[PDB]
């Protein structure tokens, strides 16, 4: 996340990092002990994925970490980047062993269709991840977070060439050096209400992060909450 800040050790306990052939290639959010939610384009290629919760610095060891192996990947059945890059960019990962919930490893709240959208319409969410600290840069050492204002789909469309489907939404700044980047993808866009955080978005493609007059594009969680809850249902 460019133009962000360092998250304090357990500030976003729902954040997870994805590791494969390369470390820190995508983010994710804890749904429950056995299920993570990420972006579909983070998991199209069939590499054995590894999930790490209770992370803070990816180069050091804090003894709060929990590694798990993904044993099932459910990309949203309508996702296809050949057709459209951004639309339906969401997926679920089932873990081998349950995470054990504690202060550093805690799920993100997922409201219903209606309230997820209300919370989105507040107009300011928290995005985070160990992505690029600059447009062209290395992965972030410590977890990065940035507060991103929701942007009108008309004004976003007039800026970015892309059509914004009802499953998508834009957030960030016009003439800024503030935005999520590659690596942050699959991570949480989260709105906080009375000191409780709700999953309002999934971080999508982030190449060419903070170009003048280009907002960040995020997957609108409100539209997928039923599906999430259905598939991640424990027992």
């Amino acid at each position: 996340v460019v133009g962000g800040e360092d998250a304090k050790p357990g500030q976003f306990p729902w954040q997870v990092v994805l590791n494969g052939k390369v470390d820190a290639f995508c983010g994710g959010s804890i749904v429950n002990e056995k299920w993570i939610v990420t972006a579909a384009h983070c998991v199209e290629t069939g590499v054995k994925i590894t999930v790490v919760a209770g992370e803070h610095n990816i180069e050091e060891t804090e003894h709060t970490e929990q590694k798990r192996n993904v044993i099932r990947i459910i990309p949203h059945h309508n996702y296809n980047a050949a057709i459209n890059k951004y639309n339906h960019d969401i997926a679920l990962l089932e873990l081998d062993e349950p995470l054990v919930l504690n202060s550093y490893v805690t799920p993100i709240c997922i409201a219903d269709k209606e309230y997820t959208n209300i919370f989105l319409k507040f107009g300011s969410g928290y995005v985070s991840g160990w992505g690029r600290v600059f447009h062209k840069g290395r992965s972030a050492l410590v977890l990065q977070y940035l507060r991103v204002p929701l942007v009108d789909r008309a004004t976003c469309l007039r800026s970015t060439k892309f059509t914004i489907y009802n499953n998508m939404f834009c957030a960030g700044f016009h003439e800024g050096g503030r935005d999520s980047c590659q690596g942050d993808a699959g991570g949480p866009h989260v709105t906080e209400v009375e000191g409780t955080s709700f999953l309002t978005g999934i971080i999508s493609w982030g190449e060419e992060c903070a170009m003048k007059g280009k907002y960040g594009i995020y997957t609108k969680v409100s539209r997928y909450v039923n599906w999430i809850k259905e598939k991640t249902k424990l027992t």
């Binding site: 304090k8 202060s103 805690t106 799920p107 709240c109 009375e194 409780t196």
Partner: protein, 55 residues
């Protein structure tokens, strides 16, 4: 002065719902419960979602 969900979320912390009567009924997300005041949400488990407990 009659309360409904479409003003200040019926003073519900998380979730509002209207009733057939002139009352609203507040609720909370999983792992929270309704407080004594029937408005606020408090934890009902060691580690409820969306909560930071480190500082």
């Amino acid at each position: 002065l009659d309360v409904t969900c479409n003003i200040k979320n019926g003073r519900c912390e998380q979730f509002c719902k209207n009733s057939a009567d002139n009352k609203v009924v507040c609720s909370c997300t999983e792992g929270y419960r309704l407080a004594e005041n029937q408005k606020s949400c408090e934890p009902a488990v060691p580690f409820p979602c969306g909560r930071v407990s480190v500082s």
